């Protein structure tokens, strides 16, 4: 029930009246508290300004061009051999395996996992990936 924009908690009232110099002490510690928060802002602004200056250049010297490849349905020998190595390295990450081969959808990779499961010891290969 205090006026709007007045602030008057029982808690704060006692803290400002419990002592002859309670008030100025309270407000002094808030002054020093605010000073040390501003001090801390200065250190992070300067720390972050140094970090921004390391990101000068972005990653633009390092971004490859984006090639699109017509998602073909036939598995060349070379494309099957890429899949087996991508399984060895990426496990069940069907998306990464697709991205490596270039012209194979995620599902086509999944289908590959079963049709060539026997002939490519795919189980052995996944076991081989889980060691490292």
């Amino acid at each position: 029930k205090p006026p709007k924009g007045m602030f008057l908690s029982q808690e704060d009232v006692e803290a400002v009246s419990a002592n002859a110099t309670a008030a100025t002490t309270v407000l002094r510690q808030l002054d020093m508290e605010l000073v040390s928060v501003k001090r801390q802002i200065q250190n992070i602004k300067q720390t972050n300004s140094a970090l921004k200056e390391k990101l000068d250049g972005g990653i633009e010297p390092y971004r490859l061009p984006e090639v699109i490849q017509k998602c073909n349905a036939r598995w060349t020998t070379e494309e099957q051999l890429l899949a087996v190595q991508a399984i060895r390295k990426y496990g069940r990450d069907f998306q990464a395996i697709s991205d490596v081969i270039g012209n194979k959808s995620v599902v086509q990779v999944k289908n590959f996992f079963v049709n060539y499961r026997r002939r490519f010891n795919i189980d052995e290969v996944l076991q081989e990936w889980e060691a490292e």
Partner: protein, 661 residues
Amino acid sequence: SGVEGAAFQSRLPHDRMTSQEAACFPDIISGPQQTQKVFLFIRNRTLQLWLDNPKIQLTFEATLQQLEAPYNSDTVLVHRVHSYLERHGLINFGIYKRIKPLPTKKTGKVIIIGSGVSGLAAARQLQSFGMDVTLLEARDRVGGRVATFRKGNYVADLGAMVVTGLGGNPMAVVSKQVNMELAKIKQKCPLYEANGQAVPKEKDEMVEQEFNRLLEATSYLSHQLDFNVLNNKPVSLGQALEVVIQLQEKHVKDEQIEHWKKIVKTQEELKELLNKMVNLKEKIKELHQQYKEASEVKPPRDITAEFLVKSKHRDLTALCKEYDELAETQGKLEEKLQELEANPPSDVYLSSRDRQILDWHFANLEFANATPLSTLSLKHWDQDDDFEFTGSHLTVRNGYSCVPVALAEGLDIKLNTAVRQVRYTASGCEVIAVNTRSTSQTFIYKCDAVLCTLPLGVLKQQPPAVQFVPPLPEWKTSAVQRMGFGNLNKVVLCFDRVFWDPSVNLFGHVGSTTASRGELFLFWNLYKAPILLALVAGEAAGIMENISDDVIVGRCLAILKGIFGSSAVPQPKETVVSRWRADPWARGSYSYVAAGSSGNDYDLMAQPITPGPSIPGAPQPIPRLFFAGEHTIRNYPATVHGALLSGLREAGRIADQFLGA
């Protein structure tokens, strides 16, 4: 309505009987509702007839002829109601032409100490009732703290000068009886900071509003947090305002800390994000080099060499995708951080200019209560608030003294007679007094009753100006100690020409320090001849009394020169400076509800004193020593109307005691 307005104008509920009426008509208030309504109409109509023409006595016979059936059928009831109104001063008070000239058989003898308004109003009443009345006045004039300076065409009031609203105010009746040139006080009051520049309209309002909110806050602090005792002593309005202001300054710092903490939290979230990016950039940089080395193994290559190119490629685009998202988040954070960096909460609760204007509002309150805020009871300082009259405040253009001077017509007043001792016994009273012009001329006044209307300041004196034999009992002296008696002073400045704004009755000077906030803080343009009044309030009142008039007038002219220009302000032709604390017949200006006191002390002040028996085992004596004056009326203290009412009260009380009701 009409009979309803009569009740309202008499400070009476129109649809209900008061405690006082219950005492005089217990048969009626304890009886059926229908008779109470008949009573209430008779009372309200008799009040109306009196109010509708207060220049002539309203007699019982006149009253009955003007009542109509069914109300004029119980003539005993009408006579009882009329006499009650008459005895208690609700009709036929003040100055009225008397129909039946005053009977010569006077009954009883009353000495009245003081011929201010309270003493004068009682005396008029007691004479009307047939008693022998003498007033003893120390000064060479009537009116007490109604004191009008008059020189030539210059007329200006050194004490009371404002009639509050006329609605419910008994001064309204008096003003129809006395030629008072009442004029509305336009409340607009421009402030000028210490440098003479006006306070801009934006700032005058921002601070007045804050002043009002600070007052509300102390009241919240009083009622909701029961913050009324601190360190075993009663809390004052001053302390409460300090505590409220301290907490508003605390909240401003709390809000600043909360704000910069949101910036630190966000900077740190950004620091963590940047570290994640410089490491990812390096990882990308190193990976690209690998892709470059592997793709420079010119084909034809075996399928592991091809897998190396294609998987470094895939690994690199993923890290670039991871880095592109982290940079989208970097923009979202640098946004927050720039919005926050631009929304800083308020720097300060009040600037130094703010605080000074605020102090003018505190000085204005110190004026209204004639005391520093550190002395006002937080719990009770505004207890008379629910009794304020309605209407505009007014001033008395021909000088308020016209009222006491008029009330004094026909009374036996011994001026220049300072009471020194009040003796009251089971058999009667003796008032010992001296001539103020030669204190050796001693006077003894024997009487049935003494009405003491000495100011609370005089009652407070140690050592005493007036000795009571036997001494006042502890319950009355303790009240006298607790009650506040404050101080307020005026400087009258009489010029030959008007250099201020003629359509502006008030303007303020904003002192540069809290300590001096009461010093010449307000100026009044109230009169026909070019006169400004200047107030000295609060802590400044008492301190300025030990400064010469020439210096006080000097400080005034310096202030006015700053506001209106040095060439516009001539030297005053006449100047007067009040020193009410030093006035031994006042010892202050008017009472205030001090910390540690309350409304009940005003009731205690009004209680009459009853001596003990002369012979032991003798029947209980009647009361002998009565009290009136502004310090004796709980609901209207510190005013002229409150004093007038207190005199009417005691005259009814004394007449009931010595003439019978």
